[PDB]
Amino acid sequence: GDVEKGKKIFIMKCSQCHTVEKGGKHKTGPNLHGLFGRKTGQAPGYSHTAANKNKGIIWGEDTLMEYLENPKKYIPGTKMIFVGIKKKEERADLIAYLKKATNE
Amino acid sequence: GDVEKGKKIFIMKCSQCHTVEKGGKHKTGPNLHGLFGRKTGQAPGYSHTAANKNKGIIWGEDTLMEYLENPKKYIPGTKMIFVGIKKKEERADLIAYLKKATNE
Ligand code: HEC
Ligand code: HEC
Known part of the structure; x- marks a missing residue:
């Protein structure tokens, strides 16, 4: 997958309720850092x-x-x-972006 | 938004299921007073x-x-x-009308 396009999808569809970065805040949904595995x-x-x-x-x-x-x-x-x-x-x-963003 | 046009839209499309006023009754749908925020x-x-x-x-x-x-x-x-x-x-x-009517 395309991580640049995935980031845009994340911002548009997910960022209302989620952050991805290490130590990022819980919102309506959980912070997603560490998700994979x-x-x-x-x-x-x-x-x-x-x-x-x-x-x-x-x-x-x-x-x-x-x-x-x-x-x-x-x-x-x-x-x-x-x-x-x-x-x-x-x-x-989106998932390619999440795989990168939630592990860096 | 145009509050007078919004009121007409509300009457036509929403009022069968909703009220907006303070202490207004629940119908099929909830009274909407206090909605914003x-x-x-x-x-x-x-x-x-x-x-x-x-x-x-x-x-x-x-x-x-x-x-x-x-x-x-x-x-x-x-x-x-x-x-x-x-x-x-x-x-x-419609939203301009709601912003007024559900707050007064
Ligand atoms: C708010 C309206 C949300 C939007 C938009 C998205 N998500 Fe969400 N997500 C939300 C909540 C409240 C929760 C917790 C659900 C529960 O029942 O406890 C979640 C959860 C997830 C999870 C699971 C996390 C885990 O098990 O560790 C993932 C993977 C997830 N959300 C991802 C995600 C993505 C990628 C979104 C955009 C497509 C997205 N969510 C939207 C609330 C909301
Ligand atoms: C009956 C057929 C409905 C019409 C027509 C409209 N709405 Fe409605 N609305 C209805 C129900 C049964 C509910 C509760 C939904 C639930 O799953 O619990 C609602 C809810 C809303 C809400 C959310 C209220 C809240 O979260 O506090 C809003 C903002 C709302 N409805 C607005 C609204 C407007 C402006 C309508 C005309 C365009 C409208 N609804 C139509 C039932 C029905």
């Missing part, structure tokens, strides 16, 4: 729903591709109220 | 959906512009069954 619902210092804590999957490209297409379908009971990103290429670009 | 899904005495309670954003001009364009896109799971207002000028006029 982590079990669902373990953002440090954030109060997740039981649903997000109990999904049990490991965040990576494939599980994010599915979640971000339709969050409530993947995690019924989530408090993330976001319709999803329909286009596969857009999710791929 | 409030987090989503906090209308006093009204039973909101989890989705409207969890969206977690603050109502204001920009967030209402987006919500009213396509309610279910912004708040998937909403029980507000309303298509939206397509035209930006109409949304802006």
Whole structure:
């Protein structure tokens, strides 16, 4: 994926509720630093729903591709109220950005 | 926005389900008094959906512009069954009316 395009998608669609940088603030949603390789619902210092804590999957490209297409379908009971990103290429670009931004 | 045009839009498209005045009754939808500056899904005495309670954003001009364009896109799971207002000028006029009427 294209990280430059992914950053723009993040700003447009996600930044209302999330930060990505190390030590970045929790907003409506959790700060996402450290996301990849982590079990669902373990953002440090954030109060997740039981649903997000109990999904049990490991965040990576494939599980994010599915979640971000339709969050409530993947995690019924989530408090993330976001319709999803329909286009596969857009999710791929977004996820490439997240992979970079949440690990630097 | 044009408050007088906004009032007409409100009567035509919204009043079947909503009141705006202080102490106004809940109908299908919540009374909207006090809307601006409030987090989503906090209308006093009204039973909101989890989705409207969890969206977690603050109502204001920009967030209402987006919500009213396509309610279910912004708040998937909403029980507000309303298509939206397509035209930006109409949304802006409506929102100007709401900003006045829900604060007086
Ligand atoms: C506010 C209306 C949100 C928008 C827009 C987006 N997200 Fe979100 N997200 C939000 C909340 C409230 C939560 C917690 C959900 C819960 O039930 O506890 C989340 C969670 C996520 C997660 C999971 C984090 C984890 O398990 O560690 C991810 C990966 C996530 N959000 C990503 C994300 C992206 C990439 C968005 C733009 C496409 C996005 N969210 C939008 C609230 C909101
Ligand atoms: C009945 C068919 C509706 C019409 C027409 C409109 N709205 Fe509505 N609205 C309705 C319901 C049942 C709800 C509650 C939704 C839920 O899931 O809990 C709402 C909610 C709103 C809100 C949010 C209120 C809040 O979070 O405090 C707003 C701002 C709102 N409605 C505005 C609104 C406007 C301006 C309308 C005309 C364009 C309108 N609604 C139509 C039901 C119905």
